[PDB]
Motif scaffolding. Structure first.
Motif, PDB file in Angstrom:
ATOM      1  N   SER A   1       0.898  -1.174  -0.140  1.00  0.00           N
ATOM      2  CA  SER A   1       0.092   0.056  -0.143  1.00  0.00           C
ATOM      3  C   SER A   1       0.819   1.300   0.056  1.00  0.00           C
ATOM      4  CB  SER A   1      -0.921  -0.153   1.383  1.00  0.00           C
ATOM      5  OG  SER A   1      -0.201  -0.070   2.355  1.00  0.00           O
TER       6      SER A   1
ATOM      7  N   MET B   1       1.559   4.979   1.738  1.00  0.00           N
ATOM      8  CA  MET B   1       1.595   5.854   2.700  1.00  0.00           C
ATOM      9  C   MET B   1       1.919   7.481   2.182  1.00  0.00           C
ATOM     10  SD  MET B   1       3.482   6.066   6.355  1.00  0.00           S
ATOM     11  CE  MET B   1       2.923   4.727   7.341  1.00  0.00           C
TER      12      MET B   1
ATOM     13  N   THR C   1      10.866   0.067   9.095  1.00  0.00           N
ATOM     14  CA  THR C   1       9.583   0.722   8.745  1.00  0.00           C
ATOM     15  C   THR C   1       9.608   2.086   9.409  1.00  0.00           C
ATOM     16  OG1 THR C   1       8.844  -1.374   8.623  1.00  0.00           O
ATOM     17  CG2 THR C   1       7.138   0.367   8.882  1.00  0.00           C
TER      18      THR C   1
ATOM     19  N   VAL D   1       8.562   5.676   7.869  1.00  0.00           N
ATOM     20  CA  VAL D   1       7.539   6.699   8.359  1.00  0.00           C
ATOM     21  C   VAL D   1       7.991   8.027   8.640  1.00  0.00           C
ATOM     22  CG1 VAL D   1       5.770   6.702  10.213  1.00  0.00           C
ATOM     23  CG2 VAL D   1       6.160   4.797   9.173  1.00  0.00           C
TER      24      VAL D   1
ATOM     25  N   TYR E   1       5.776   6.467   0.973  1.00  0.00           N
ATOM     26  CA  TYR E   1       6.216   5.062   1.478  1.00  0.00           C
ATOM     27  C   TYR E   1       5.382   3.960   1.033  1.00  0.00           C
ATOM     28  CZ  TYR E   1       8.882   1.968   4.528  1.00  0.00           C
ATOM     29  OH  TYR E   1       9.352   0.597   4.771  1.00  0.00           O
TER      30      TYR E   1
ATOM     31  N   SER F   1      -0.104  -3.002   4.076  1.00  0.00           N
ATOM     32  CA  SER F   1      -1.296  -2.183   4.429  1.00  0.00           C
ATOM     33  C   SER F   1      -1.697  -2.218   5.903  1.00  0.00           C
ATOM     34  CB  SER F   1      -2.530  -2.877   3.756  1.00  0.00           C
ATOM     35  OG  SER F   1      -2.662  -4.413   3.847  1.00  0.00           O
TER      36      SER F   1
ATOM     37  N   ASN G   1       0.674   0.178   7.494  1.00  0.00           N
ATOM     38  CA  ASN G   1       0.089   1.380   6.879  1.00  0.00           C
ATOM     39  C   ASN G   1      -0.983   1.709   7.758  1.00  0.00           C
ATOM     40  OD1 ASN G   1      -0.205   3.817   5.444  1.00  0.00           O
ATOM     41  ND2 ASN G   1      -0.461   2.677   3.674  1.00  0.00           N
ATOM     42  N   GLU G   2      -1.927   1.043   8.124  1.00  0.00           N
ATOM     43  CA  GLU G   2      -3.220   1.296   8.904  1.00  0.00           C
ATOM     44  C   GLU G   2      -3.175   1.299  10.117  1.00  0.00           C
ATOM     45  OE1 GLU G   2      -6.279  -1.727   6.477  1.00  0.00           O
ATOM     46  OE2 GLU G   2      -4.964  -2.550   7.918  1.00  0.00           O
TER      47      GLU G   2
ATOM     48  N   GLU H   1      -1.419   5.196  10.796  1.00  0.00           N
ATOM     49  CA  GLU H   1      -2.659   5.931  10.449  1.00  0.00           C
ATOM     50  C   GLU H   1      -3.445   6.388  11.619  1.00  0.00           C
ATOM     51  OE1 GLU H   1      -5.457   4.174   7.637  1.00  0.00           O
ATOM     52  OE2 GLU H   1      -5.165   6.227   6.257  1.00  0.00           O
TER      53      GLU H   1
ATOM     54  N   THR I   1      -0.339  10.912   8.782  1.00  0.00           N
ATOM     55  CA  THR I   1      -0.181  10.036   7.591  1.00  0.00           C
ATOM     56  C   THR I   1      -1.432   9.445   7.085  1.00  0.00           C
ATOM     57  OG1 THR I   1       0.376   8.089   8.731  1.00  0.00           O
ATOM     58  CG2 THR I   1       2.195   9.592   8.160  1.00  0.00           C
TER      59      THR I   1
ATOM     60  N   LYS J   1      -3.081   6.146   4.451  1.00  0.00           N
ATOM     61  CA  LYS J   1      -3.250   5.092   3.502  1.00  0.00           C
ATOM     62  C   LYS J   1      -4.033   5.793   2.197  1.00  0.00           C
ATOM     63  CE  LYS J   1      -5.260   0.435   2.582  1.00  0.00           C
ATOM     64  NZ  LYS J   1      -4.935   0.496   0.940  1.00  0.00           N
TER      65      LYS J   1
END
Ligand SMILES: CC(C)S(=O)(=O)NCCc1ccc(CCNS(=O)(=O)C(C)C)cc1
Ligand SMILES: N[C@@H](CCC(=O)O)C(=O)O
Ligand SMILES: N[C@@H](CCC(=O)O)C(=O)O
Ligand SMILES: [Zn+2]
Ligand SMILES: [Zn+2]
Ligand SMILES: [Zn+2]
Lengths: 259, 258
Positions: free
Chosen positions: A110, A112, A172, A176, A188, A192, A195-196, A199, A206, A208
Motif C-alpha cells: 500500500s 503511505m 519501517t 514513516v 512510502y 497495508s 500502514n493502517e 494511520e 499520515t 493510506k
C-alpha cells in the motif's frame, strides 16, 4: 521437550518493548500482537518457548552473490531458531527453504502519504517525479517491485532502483519518519497492516491512499520438515475460527488508536 | 496418469458454457476455477479431467456414521485426486485432507433484496419478520452451529428451529429465494458469491454490512498426495504473477452487468 526458540522482529504493533521492560525478564519484556499470538500458539501446541529478537533486524532475503539468507528466514534456515512468529510475508522464494502456516493475517502492499500529498494511486506515483517514493530496503515489498512484469510497477521499480539519494529505508520506522519529515515530497510503499496501524497513531499526519497493489498474508514459519509445522498450522486454523485473530487485530490496531 | 479433478457448479467458478451441448470433456465448462485448473495443470505438468461432484455438495461429516460427503468425501474415499473449487479451508477438513495456501479470500456476508431494512447480522438477530438462512453441508452452516458470539449464537438458535426450513441445497436456490421473497428472506453466504451476484441482472440484490469472518479457499488434495507440494507452489507463483487477481477481475467485474 526442549524450549522452543522463537525468532521475531521489533515492528509495531507486532512486537514492542514494554515501557518497564528493564524491570522484567524473558518473554515478559515484550508486548504486541505477535507476543499475544506466540503465547496462544505455544499453549495450543503444548510447548515452552523463548522470544528472541532477530540479530540483524531483518525479515529475510537471500544474497544473490553469497547465497546466504539473512533476517528471521536466515535464523530458521541455519538452525538458530525453531519458529518465527512475526509479520513475515509468505512468498514463493521463502516457501522453497522454509515452511509457512496458513496465513494468520491478510495484507497487501500500500501507499503511505503525508496528509495533503497530491497522490491517490500507484499510477499517480509512477507518472511523476516531484514526489519520491521507496520501500523497506530488504523484504517482500522490495522484491515485489524488483520482479513485477506489470507496467505501472515495473516503471516504479525502474525509478526506485536508480533514485539518488537512496529511496530505500532500513526499518519501517525510518520510512514513516521520512514521510513525516519530507513535507509531502516522499511517499512510502509498505504493507497495508503497518500502514493502517500508523494511520491511527499520533501525530495523525499520515494516510493510506489507493487500493492495495497485491493480496497476500503473514504465516508462522518453521524450518523445512520441522516437528512443529503441522500442530502450528492446526492452531492457526483453530484461532482463526474462534475469532481470536480478529480480536487481537482490533486490540492492537483500533482499540489503542490515538486518532 | 490423468488427474481426476472434482469441482462444483457454482458461478462464476465453474459454469456450463452457453454452447456446452456441442462440446466435450473439459471444454464444456468455463469460469474462475476452470481457468485456475488449466494454470495449475500447466505449472505442475499434468493432464486432467474436470468432474462435477456427484452429490452437488462441498463436504461435511455425518455426525453418526462419520462419513464425509461432497468434494471432501470424493478426496477422502479416493474418487478424485484434487479439488479445485471455492472450497473453504476449515479445521475439521484440514484434519482429513490437505489444502494449499488460500487462492482467494472471503468472509461470510449477508445478501438482501434491495430495500430490505437490514444493515447487519445484529439487525437480523433482533427481529422475526425477515427470515434468514444458509447453504446446507457447507462451512457457513458450521460457522453458525459452532459460534459462541452472542449475535451469531442467537441466529443459530433461530435458524435450526425455523419452520419452514431456512436452509437451502444450493447457492442458486438461496439467491432465488431472496429474489422471490419480497424482502422477507435474507441469505447468509460467502462474500465472493454475494459480490458476484450483486453485479448480475436483474441487479436486485445487495451485500450489506461487513463480513462476519475472514478466511480463504484452498486447493485440496487427499492426505499424503504427491501433488500437494507442487500445487501449493503453483498457487504461490500464480498469486505473485498477479494472475489470480487477473482471473478475479475477469470473472467478477469485467463481466458485470449492473
Ligand atoms: C483459514 C484461514 C486461517 S486462511 O488460511 O484463509 N487465512 C485467512 C487470511 C487470508 C486469507 C486469504 C488470503 C489470500 C492470499 N493467500 S496467501 O497464502 O497469502 C498468498 C501468499 C497465496 C490471505 C490471507
Ligand atoms: N513483511 C515483509 C517486510 C515488510 C515489507 O517488505 O514491506 C517481509 O516479510 O519481508
Ligand atoms: N465454500 C463453502 C460452501 C458455501 C457456504 O457454505 O457458504 C464450503 O466450502 O463449505
Ligand atoms: Zn487459546
Ligand atoms: Zn501460468
Ligand atoms: Zn446421518
Amino acid at each position: 521437550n526442549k524450549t522452543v526458540v522463537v525468532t521475531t522482529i521489533l515492528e509495531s504493533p507486532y512486537v514492542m518493548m514494554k515501557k518497564n521492560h528493564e524491570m522484567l525478564e524473558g518473554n515478559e519484556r515484550y508486548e504486541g500482537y505477535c507476543v499475544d499470538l506466540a503465547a496462544e500458539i505455544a499453549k495450543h501446541c503444548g510447548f515452552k518457548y523463548k522470544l528472541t529478537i532477530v540479530g540483524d533486524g531483518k525479515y529475510g532475503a537471500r544474497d544473490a552473490d553469497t547465497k546466504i539468507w539473512n533476517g528471521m528466514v536466515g535464523e530458521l534456515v541455519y538452525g538458530k531458531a525453531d519458529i518465527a512468529i512475526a509479520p513475515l510475508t509468505i512468498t514463493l522464494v521463502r516457501e522453497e527453504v522454509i515452511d509457512f502456516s496458513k496465513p494468520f493475517m491478510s495484507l497487501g502492499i500500500s501507499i503511505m502519504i503525508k496528509k495533503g500529498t497530491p497522490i491517490e494511486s500507484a499510477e499517480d506515483l509512477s507518472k511523476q517525479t516531484e514526489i519520491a517514493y521507496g520501500t523497506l530496503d530488504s523484504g517482500s515489498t522490495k522484491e515485489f517491485f524488483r520482479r513485477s512484469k506489470i507496467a505501472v510497477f515495473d516503471k516504479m521499480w525502474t525509478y526506485m532502483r536508480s533514485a539518488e539519494p537512496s529511496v530505500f529505508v532500513r526499518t519501517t520506522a525510518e520510512g514513516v519518519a521520512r514521510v513525516r519529515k519530507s513535507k509531502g515530497k516522499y511517499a512510502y510503499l509498505l504493507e497495508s497492516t503497518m500502514n493502517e496501524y500508523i494511520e491511527q497513531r499520533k501525530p495523525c499526519d499520515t494516510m493510506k491512499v489507493g487500493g492495495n497493489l497485491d493480496s497476500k498474508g503473514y504465516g508462522i514459519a518453521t524450518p523445512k520438515g520441522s516437528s512443529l509445522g503441522n500442530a502450528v498450522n492446526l492452531a492457526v486454523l483453530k484461532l482463526n475460527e474462534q475469532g481470536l485473530l480478529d480480536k487481537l487485530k482490533n486490540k492492537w490496531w483500533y482499540d489503542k488508536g490515538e486518532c
